[PDB]
């Protein structure tokens, strides 16, 4: 295969990206949600799509298995985006990375225990606040961690704050703003710019 491989996260990212793609001349030929397929052809026979877990998109793109992808700044910050180009803020799937603790419970006086997916983001943030923390890596749902005293706080993605409040947690500190970004393999940007430029302009046009 000689054209562009686009890495997409399933769920929120996928649904909000289809309009940008359609405008760039790239329609998927069926609905992924009801398919046992992970490589999808499109109406542009140069472009094909991979449906991945959001955390694997930077991996596939940096190694060139995908030429470009859409992933949240949250996944990019955690993973480290040194080996890819973040060309475009797409301003889709907007949320924030925040610390969160039990509702009305105060910070204890001991060494803070943080439970999170976003281990590197956590270390970075608490470093910048001059705070030394013990970090516990969680792959799954983090809202449980403070309630059984695994961690004092969690670092997680927050939109309305409804998921926190419904589990007896509340947002404390704002770490940074999160939006899905267009990332490109460094080599793919140099070698396949002719194939990319039309789609990057159509994405640039769709946003502004």
């Amino acid at each position: 295969f000689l054209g562009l491989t686009l890495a997409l996260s399933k769920g929120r990212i996928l649904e909000e990206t289809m309009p940008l793609l359609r405008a760039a001349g790239v329609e998927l030929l069926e609905d992924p949600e009801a398919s046992r397929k992970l490589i999808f052809p499109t109406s542009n026979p140069n472009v094909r799509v991979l449906i991945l877990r959001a955390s694997d998109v930077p991996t596939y793109v940096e190694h060139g298995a995908a030429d470009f992808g859409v992933a949240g700044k949250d996944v990019l910050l955690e993973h480290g985006a040194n080996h890819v180009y973040e060309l475009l803020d797409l301003k889709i799937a907007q949320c924030k990375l925040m610390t969160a603790g039990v509702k009305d419970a105060p910070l204890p006086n001991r060494r803070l225990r943080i439970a999170t997916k976003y281990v590197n983001v956590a270390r970075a943030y608490f470093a910048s606040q001059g705070q030394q923390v013990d970090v516990i890596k969680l792959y799954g749902s983090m809202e449980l961690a403070p309630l059984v005293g695994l961690g004092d706080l969690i670092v997680d993605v927050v939109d309305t704050g409804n998921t926190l409040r419904a589990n007896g947690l509340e947002a404390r500190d704002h770490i940074c703003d999160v939006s899905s970004r267009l990332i490109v393999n460094q080599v793919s940007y140099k070698r396949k710019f002719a194939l990319l430029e039309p789609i990057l302009d159509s994405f640039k046009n769709s946003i502004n």
Partner: protein, 378 residues
Amino acid sequence: GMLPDGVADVLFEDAHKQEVLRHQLTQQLITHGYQLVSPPMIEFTESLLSGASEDLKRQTFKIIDQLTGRLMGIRADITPQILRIDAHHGGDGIARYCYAGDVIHTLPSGLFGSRTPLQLGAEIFGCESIAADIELIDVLFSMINSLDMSAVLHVDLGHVTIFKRLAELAALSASDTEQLMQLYANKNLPELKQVCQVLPMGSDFYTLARFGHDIANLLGRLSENAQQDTKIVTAIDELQRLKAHLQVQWQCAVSIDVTELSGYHYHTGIVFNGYINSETQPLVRGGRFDGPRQATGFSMDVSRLLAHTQLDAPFIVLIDYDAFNNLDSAQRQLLLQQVASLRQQGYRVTMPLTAEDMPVGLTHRLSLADNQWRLHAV
């Protein structure tokens, strides 16, 4: 017997291939008027790292000379050694050098990179003209083409002069330069747009990252202060000249990136990166340097060619054990002359020690039939 990450044996046919490539390519460069030099693996750090960036210093293993107590280094790069050699032998005129040697890196450069590349390269000293930069491209593509590879070389052109002039004209701090070089290296366009709105000539630094690829129109997008700078206008003109030469002479797809500062920071002008297929780490790295003498050159890891080059299947011959031991002295002498003839023609002939002595990947037997020795495919 596990090996350190980024350290691999090159074994058997791969080792034969590597040896052929090293030799073909070295002889090509020698016939193009480049003087072969073979500098040592170790020097004192005073000479080996004389005018070196932190990146080259960090890639160089340090060891102790027990004769003097002084620090030495295992070379991570030969180019600085060519500089030392040229300083003594080169004189004021034009001088050409080529080299092939092992170098050691403390850390791998890219995803699953080697720490033990076989560095092969050429340097031209004593010519200011872009003509010297064009000769090296011609020599390199002459070499690449001779390998009859299926894989294709994408060339990336950069120019460090452009950013360095903008840094001087905008009078950037030591730390502001670091933050821009970090952002450029991941082409973080959003976070760069924010940083650039508060920096002096900040729009020019953003222009490099967003519109650096379009070298035809880059000058017309820069600030009037920048556009007036002769060293910036020359730099952008040098990129256009090389881009044109590569497309016209060599039918080479060139991409420009004027924010490429990831090569060794002894580079003072034009920079070249040759990528093979879709591989992250470039095969070839080259550019201008000046450690009061003009210099330009390139280096490549010969070991990275292995997976993309093929040799003719070798002829691996085993002399029949029983037949040979049945021979009189005069008959044995007669065979050895015939075996010597086969080896001269490049046949791999094993004189067996036992009936079971079997060469790896046997293709032919040398067998005795009716008082005569002939080859027989197995």
